[PDB]
């Protein structure tokens, strides 16, 4: 018995087009259909410079924007050998972590709105509209902040942003507590989530989950502890790791990972060195407006970096960061030219949404939206 | 194993005046009345809402909204036709054609940003050498018809003169970065 | 005495040492079928001998873990059983030996990578206990 389970609530899971082969109410197999959001991203990037390539990444995962620009930047610094300053690293993490918070605040309470709890959605989205007052203030666009450029980061924080991020972090433990007091204790929540989509660790490894769905099963594997790719080796934070694997562990993790991300934000705030914002290598970082206008040699680079590009040397690397969805890695083959060459984007949600087939076997049809909830399936990456 | 796991996870809470504590929580909703109480606290608290048309959300001088071609204080469009923004544009929205005007100084005969084919990433504002193209904080230009949304060659992007009073302010405050 | 492996699915095995001895003896016996002058057989022999030795010497699973610093004995059993699968697989489609042409181009690019880039750091040494 085949059922074309589509997007239950649009605007939350946009193009979800499962084709469930059911058995009464018990689902026997879930066959997701991809491509409804397949923009030509892995082709369009081959046609544009390494700078023009960056805006696609904030548009790859639309609920955790800067994590993908941070995964791309670290793939055009893996090749460029472009050492970025300490302040660029600290800002880059303070925003990758603000993005982890922006994602878990959505991927928890959009999940909690698919399950049925209507209010956590709107509380978490007031919180997200506080964090977009930081995105929009530091770069310009509330969602797609093309801000974490290859060398360092686009431009320094405004002169009042750390004070505001602090005044937000002080009041954010309470918001997590409310999102938690409203959902963690509920017997209507546990019942809707405990023993739902349980993934034994061998399955989370096999299906390349590598995210909050690889730390549910108990595999202690965070690419901020495994492969520290910034000040992360300096910052202190504990990676919460589940013990059962059910969608109630992944929720409890995403609601603790939203507190450890608060620890990382507070650290990045309390220790942010007053250094240069971009790599001093002005052939990888366009010089400031003031310098390119006054200096002829800076003007030449501002011209050959906003038209030509880097021309990062010939290589091929797989740089993977811990994006909120999971291990978002961008395999970036680079022909010597200024344009990338098959900038393949390993995006979790392409490996997670595979897991829907075995996660939601023998679960009731109303659980198939809870699974899609805890996978944090955002179809931009799929 | 799940059978033994159940037996043990239920033999953990197996001492009187603990079975009673858990029974009371299930018998009289305790976690759920803590949900209702929080929900009530938020029902009575002030509302984080904004009656939009009259007051609008906070922005920043770096905010990227409607593209505006700036002008030099003494008229003379700031847009010398280098085509750097036409080059840097990721979506290739800007189409620039250049002609030595009769005065002799280069200028763009055609400077058409296609707003629909535009990602509002501010690359044009960065790439332009003289700050000729900047994004005005407008962001309120929803058009009834698509053809209007294609911003014509240097005529509608020349409406930035109205927004110059705010664009000049944002630039005077952002240029420090 | 072990309550549970934190990992889900890897069920705690009470008779860890015994099945480990069984698996490592099976592995030592089954590896004999691959040619001796193959790096795979030297490796299997060496680490299987080391783990079988440390499993015979020590008695508790905790001491097996402590000396043989390779995680948990349940994951060790997973590794040993997967190794037995591989040796019984390698017997088939035997890849041992090198054909005459053997063109293998080792390529080394030594460009240093910037430190602040994902670099898989080694992690704690078996002095974790």
């Amino acid at each position: 018995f085949t059922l074309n389970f589509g997007p239950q609530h649009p605007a939350a899971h946009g193009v979800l087009r499962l084709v469930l082969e059911m058995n009464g109410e018990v689902v026997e197999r879930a066959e997701p259909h991809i491509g409804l959001l397949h923009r030509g991203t892995e082709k369009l990037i081959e046609y544009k410079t390494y700078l023009q390539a960056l805006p696609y990444f904030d548009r790859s995962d639309y609920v955790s924007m800067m994590a993908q620009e941070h995964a791309y930047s670290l793939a055009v610094e893996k090749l460029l050998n472009c050492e970025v300053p300490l302040r660029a690293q600290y800002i880059r993490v303070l925003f990758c972590e603000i993005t982890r918070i922006l994602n878990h605040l959505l991927a928890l309470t959009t999940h909690a709105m698919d399950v049925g709890a209507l209010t956590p959605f709107l509380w978490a989205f007031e919180e997200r509209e506080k964090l977009l007052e930081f995105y929009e203030r530091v770069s310009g666009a509330r969602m797609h902040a093309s801000f974490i450029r290859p060398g360092g980061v686009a431009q320094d924080l405004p002169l009042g942003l750390c004070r505001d991020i602090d005044s937000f972090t002080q009041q954010f433990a309470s918001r997590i507590d409310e999102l938690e007091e409203m959902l963690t204790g509920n017997r209507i929540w546990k019942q809707r989530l405990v023993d739902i989509g349980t993934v034994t660790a061998q399955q989370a490894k096999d299906w390349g989950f590598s995210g909050v769905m690889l730390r549910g099963p108990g595999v202690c594997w965070d690419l901020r502890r495994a492969a520290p790719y910034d000040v992360y080796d300096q910052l202190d934070f504990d990676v919460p790791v589940g013990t059962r694997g059910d969608c109630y562990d992944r929720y409890c993790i995403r609601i603790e990972e939203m507190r450890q991300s608060l620890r990382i934000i507070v650290q990045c705030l309390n220790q942010m060195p007053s250094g240069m914002i971009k790599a001093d290598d002005r052939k990888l970082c366009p010089p400031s407006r003031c310098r390119m206008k006054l200096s002829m040699e800076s003007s030449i680079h501002h011209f050959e970096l906003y038209t030509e590009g880097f021309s990062v040397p010939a290589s091929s690397t797989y740089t993977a960061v811990e994006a909120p969805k999971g291990e978002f890695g961008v395999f970036l083959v680079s022909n010597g030219s200024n344009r990338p060459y098959r900038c393949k984007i390993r995006a979790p949600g392409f490996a997670h949404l595979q897991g829907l087939d075995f996660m939601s076997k023998h679960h009731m049809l109303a659980d198939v939206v809870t699974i899609i909830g805890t996978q944090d399936i955002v179809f931009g990456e799929v | 194993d799940d059978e033994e796991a159940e037996q043990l996870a239920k033999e953990i809470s197996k001492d009187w005046s603990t079975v009673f504590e858990r029974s009371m929580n299930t018998l009289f909703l305790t976690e759920m009345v803590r949900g209702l109480s929080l929900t009530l606290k938020y029902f009575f608290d002030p509302k984080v809402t904004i009656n939009y048309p009259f007051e609008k959300g906070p922005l920043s001088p770096r905010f990227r909204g409607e593209h505006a071609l700036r002008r030099y204080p003494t008229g003379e469009e700031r847009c010398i036709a280098c085509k750097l923004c036409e080059a840097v544009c990721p979506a290739q929205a800007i189409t620039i054609e250049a002609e030595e005007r009769e005065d002799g100084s280069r200028r763009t005969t055609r400077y058409d940003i296609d707003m629909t084919k535009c990602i509002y990433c501010g690359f044009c504002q960065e790439a332009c050498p003289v700050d000729a193209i900047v994004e005005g904080p407008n962001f309120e230009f929803a058009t009834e018809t698509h053809e209007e949304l294609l911003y014509d060659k240097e005529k509608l992007l020349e409406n930035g003169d109205r927004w110059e009073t705010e664009i000049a302010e944002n630039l005077r405050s952002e240029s420090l970065y | 005495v072990k309550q549970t492996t934190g990992i889900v699915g890897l069920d705690v095995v009470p008779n860890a040492r015994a099945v480990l001895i069984d698996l490592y003896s099976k592995t030592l016996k089954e590896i004999q079928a691959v040619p001796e002058d193959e790096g795979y057989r030297k490796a299997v022999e060496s680490f299987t001998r080391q783990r079988l030795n440390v499993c015979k010497e020590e008695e508790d699973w905790e001491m097996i873990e402590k000396r043989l610093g390779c995680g948990q004995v349940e994951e060790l059993i997973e590794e040993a059983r997967d190794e037995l699968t591989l040796i019984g697989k390698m017997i088939e489609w035997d890849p041992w030996g090198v054909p005459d042409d053997y063109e293998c181009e080792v390529i080394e690019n030594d460009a240093p990578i910037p430190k602040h880039v994902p670099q898989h750091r080694p992690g704690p040494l078996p002095e974790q206990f």
Binding site: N23, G24, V26, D238, C252 | - | -
Partner: peptide, 24 residues
């Protein structure tokens, strides 16, 4: 249907961090 029902019993909540709390 003999499908495995979602048993809403489990072990009690105990926040499980990684071993790198104090000294890696």
């Amino acid at each position: 249907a003999a499908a495995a029902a979602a048993a809403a019993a489990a072990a009690a909540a105990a926040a499980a961090a990684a071993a790198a709390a104090a000294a890696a």
